[PDB]
Ligand binder design. Structure first.
Ligand SMILES: COc1cnc(O[C@@H]2C[C@H]3C(=O)N[C@]4(C(=O)NS(=O)(=O)C5CC5)C[C@H]4/C=C\CCCCC[C@H](NC(=O)OC(C)(C)C)C(=O)N3C2)c2cc(Cl)ccc12
Ligand SMILES: [Zn+2]
Length: 198
């Protein structure tokens, strides 16, 4: 019935992938119970840092990447959900189910990657475990892993970046190309598709 209809939670930032050292590592900034509360209220008073966020809904965890002042992630992860912020829930600024892309205004304190202009096919995929994986660009939206990995390794990383050697955002990871449970390639949303969206 209509009087007791439930709301869907906000996406919640629960950690980050630190890329600002000589070492990449994941940091958690909020645990599960805290995440649940924040998802319902939408009020997240934590201080955000960096380019790559670890984000959660009540049922899934994945990544989000800031580019040009926008925090971007995958639709199949975020749906049309708001994101928790210091002032309450923030509505998506961009939503495109066909591209599997959503975005919100980037959090105060985050930093954005610059969209890539270098034309390079030597790419680097950043996973939720802070692995930095070399990927050879193969097309507009595809790249090959130099070393194939079981998918289990890539699961939870949709929304993360593909970076060029200069650390320029090239795209947002979206899907794994798989055979017999082995990812041999990745599908991504090119940074150029985000700029058309913007
Ligand atoms: C809303 O539009 C949409 C929804 N879903 C998907 O694709 C789904 C979700 C991804 C996914 O899990 N991403 C992931 C992911 O990690 N998602 S997530 O973070 O874990 C989830 C969001 C919380 C990058 C892949 C990671 C693990 C692989 C597990 C299953 C792989 C199957 C699969 N691959 C496949 O679809 O590839 C084709 C296009 C070549 C046919 C796949 O990766 N996905 C299947 C797509 C894919 C594409 Cl190309 C375009 C749109 C679109
Ligand atoms: Zn470049």
């Amino acid at each position: 019935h209509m009087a007791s209809m439930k709301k869907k939670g906000s996406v919640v930032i629960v950690g980050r992938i630190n890329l600002s050292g000589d070492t990449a590592y994941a940091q958690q900034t909020r645990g599960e119970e805290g995440c649940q509360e924040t998802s319902q209220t939408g009020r997240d008073k934590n201080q955000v840092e960096g380019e790559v966020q670890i984000v959660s809904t009540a049922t899934q965890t994945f990544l989000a990447t800031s580019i040009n002042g926008v925090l971007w992630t995958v639709y199949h992860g975020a749906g049309t959900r708001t994101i928790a912020s210091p002032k309450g829930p923030v509505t998506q600024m961009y939503t495109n189910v066909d591209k599997d892309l959503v975005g919100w205004q980037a959090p105060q304190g985050s930093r954005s990657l610059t969209p890539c202009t270098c034309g390079s096919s030597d790419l680097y995929l950043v996973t939720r475990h802070a692995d930095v994986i070399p990927v050879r660009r193969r097309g507009d939206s595809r790249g090959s892993l130099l070393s194939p990995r079981p998918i289990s390794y890539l699961k939870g990383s949709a929304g993360g970046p593909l970076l060029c050697p200069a650390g320029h955002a090239v795209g947002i990871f979206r899907a794994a190309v798989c055979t017999r449970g082995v990812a041999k390639a990745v599908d991504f949303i090119p940074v150029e598709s985000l700029e058309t969206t913007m």
